[PDB]
Amino acid sequence: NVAPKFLANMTSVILPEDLPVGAQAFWLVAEDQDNDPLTYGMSGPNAYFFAVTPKTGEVKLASALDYETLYTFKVTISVSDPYIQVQREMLVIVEDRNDNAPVFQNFSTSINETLPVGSVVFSVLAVDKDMGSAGMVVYSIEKVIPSTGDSEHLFRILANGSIVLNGSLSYNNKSAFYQLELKACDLGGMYHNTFTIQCSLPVFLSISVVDQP
Amino acid sequence: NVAPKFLANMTSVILPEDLPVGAQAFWLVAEDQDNDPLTYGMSGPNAYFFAVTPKTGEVKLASALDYETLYTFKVTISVSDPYIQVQREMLVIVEDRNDNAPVFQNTAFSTSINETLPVGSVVFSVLAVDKDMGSAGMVVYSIEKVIPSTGDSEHLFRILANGSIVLNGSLSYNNKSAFYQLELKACDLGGMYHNTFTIQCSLPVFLSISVVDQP
Ligand SMILES: *[C@@H]1O[C@H](CO)[C@@H](O[C@@H]2O[C@H](CO)[C@@H](O[C@@H]3O[C@H](CO)[C@@H](O)[C@H](O)[C@@H]3O)[C@H](O)[C@H]2NC(C)=O)[C@H](O)[C@H]1NC(C)=O
Ligand SMILES: *[C@@H]1O[C@H](CO)[C@@H](O[C@@H]2O[C@H](CO)[C@@H](O[C@@H]3O[C@H](CO)[C@@H](O)[C@H](O)[C@@H]3O)[C@H](O)[C@H]2NC(C)=O)[C@H](O)[C@H]1NC(C)=O
Ligand SMILES: [Ca+2]
Ligand SMILES: [Ca+2]
Ligand SMILES: [Ca+2]
Ligand SMILES: [Ca+2]
Ligand SMILES: [Ca+2]
Ligand SMILES: [Ca+2]
Ligand SMILES: [Cl-]
Ligand SMILES: [Cl-]
Ligand code: NA
Ligand code: NA
C-alpha cells in the first residue's frame, strides 16, 4: 500500500468572511497510487466552521467566519486509505469585507445665543468594527428642524465629529431650539463582490439656545 | 471652560499578548488648560480586556489578550471635566509571543507492521499543531526514547518533518523484538515569551509498534 498524498493546494485556503453558511467552500483532494477508496476528515479545535463529506471531500461552511473574531486559524485535514491515515494541517486565511457599520456612542446640549461663529457646540463619536478605509467614519447632518432661518446652514459637522457654528442665532428672531439628525457612514469597502458604503441609523441631537438679553 | 484634551499617544497602544492579567497596561493621560479635575473611563464592545481607575487613568489588563483571536481592536476612551466629556477611539495593536505549544490530537497511538517490510518504507505518521503562526508555529518532530533500547533499536526508526516515521533498519519477531515503544515529542522552532527566546515543546506521546511474524 502507498499512503494517499494530498494535492499541493491543501496547505492553505483563502475564504472570504461574507461567505454564506452551507456554501461549498472547497474540496479535500488527494491521490493514491493504488487507487484505494479514499475517506476524508477534518479534526481539532477549529473544525466546527466546516463540514466534510467523508467520501467525496466536499467541505461546506457550518459556522460564520469573522475577520473581527478569527482572522486566520489552522485545521487538521485527513485522507485515509484502507491501511493508513495521513493527517496534515491547513491554514484558513479569512478575508475582510465591509460587514459592520458605524455605531454611535451615547445627545442634547444647550448653547448661548451670543456664541461666536466657528465655536464648537457639540462633538459626536461613532466607531466601525472594521479596520482601514471600511472603518473610517464620515459625519453628516441630514436634517435640521426647524428648517426656518437657513437652519440647513446654521451648523456644520467636520471629521472629528465636532459640530461647529456656521451661522448666528437669535432666541427671539430665529429659534430657541434646533433638532439635528446625524448619520455616520464608512468611507467604503467590499461586501458581496460589490462596493458597499455601510451607514448608521440616524441619531438626533437637541440643541437649546439660551437667551442672554 | 476649555474641554480636556488627550495626549497625542492616546490614539494607539502596542501591547504584547504575554502581558499577564492584572498588569499595568498603560495610562489614560489628558490635559485641561483650565486645570479642572479629570475623570477617565473606557467604553465599547471591547473594553472587557481593561480596568480603568476613574480618577488616576491607570489601565490594567482584566482579560487575557491573544494574537490568534483578536490581533487588533478599537476601544472608546473618555475624559471628562466637571462640564464636558471628550470621547475618542483608541486602537489596540497586539503583538505575537511564543505563547502556544505543539499539541497532538491523540496522546497514544498504536500500529502493527510486518517483519518483511523493506527499509525506507513508512510505518506510521504523526501530526502536532501549534496555534502559533510563523516560525513559532513550525513543529520539529523527534524520537526521544526507544523501548526496547537495544543498540539496533535506537537506529531502526527516524521521524521526518512531515511526521512520517520511516524504517532506517531491518526487523525480526524472533531474532530482535516483537514490540518497540517510541516516545515522540513536537517542539516549535522558537520565538519570544516573557522577553526570552522560548522553544515551547509538547508532552511525551507514545507509539506502540507490534511486529507480525511472516515465516
Ligand atoms: C484545491 O484544488 C482542488 C483541485 O482543483 C479543488 O477541488 C476542485 O474544486 C472545484 C471547485 O470548488 C470542484 O468543482 C466543482 O465540482 C462539483 C462536482 O461535480 C460541481 O458540481 C461544481 O459546480 C464545481 O464544478 C472540483 O470538483 C474539485 N476537483 C476535484 C478533482 O475534486 C479544491 O477546491 C482546492 N482545495 C483547496 C484547499 O483550495
Ligand atoms: C501615553 O504617554 C503617557 C505619558 O508618557 C503614559 O503615561 C505614563 O505611563 C507610565 C507607564 O507607561 C507611568 O509610569 C508609571 O508610574 C507609576 C506611578 O504612577 C509607577 O508605579 C510605575 O512604576 C511607572 O513608573 C506614568 O505614571 C504615566 N504618566 C503619567 C503622567 O500619568 C501612557 O502610558 C501613554 N499611553 C499610551 C496609550 O501608550
Ligand atoms: Ca495506497
Ligand atoms: Ca469585516
Ligand atoms: Ca464598515
Ligand atoms: Ca476645563
Ligand atoms: Ca502567539
Ligand atoms: Ca509556539
Ligand atoms: Cl488543529
Ligand atoms: Cl500534547
Ligand atoms: Na464579520
Ligand atoms: Na496567543
Residue numbers in the entry:
A (entry chain B): 1 to 106, 109 to 215
B (entry chain A): 1 to 215
Passage from the reporting paper:
PCDH24 belongs to the Cr-2 subfamily and has 9 EC repeats, a membrane adjacent domain (MAD10), a transmembrane domain, and a C-terminal cytoplasmic domain. PCDH24 is most similar to CDH23, having the residues and elongated N-terminal β-strand that are predicted to favor the formation of an atypical calcium-binding site at its tip. Here, we present X-ray crystal structures of the PCDH24 and CDHR5 extracellular tips and analyze their species-specific features relevant for adhesive interactions.
As expected, all EC repeats in all 3 PCDH24 structures adopt the typical 7 β-strand Greek-key fold seen in extracellular domains of cadherin proteins, with β-strands labeled A to G for each repeat. The crystallographic packings observed for the hs and mm PCDH24 structures show various interfaces that further highlight differences across species. Remarkably, there are 2 sets of potential antiparallel trans dimers. Unexpectedly, bead aggregation experiments using hs PCDH24 EC1-2Fc p.Y67A and hs PCDH24 EC1-3Fc p.Y67A showed larger calcium-dependent aggregates than when using the wild-type protein fragments. In contrast, bead aggregation experiments using hs PCDH24 EC1-2Fc p.Y71A did not show aggregation with results similar to EDTA controls, while the size of the aggregates mediated by hs PCDH24 EC1-3Fc p.Y71A were markedly reduced when compared to those mediated by the wild-type protein. The tyrosine residue in the human protein (p.Y71), important for trans homophilic adhesion as suggested by our structure and bead aggregation assays, is not conserved, and it is switched to a smaller proline (p.P71) in the mouse protein.
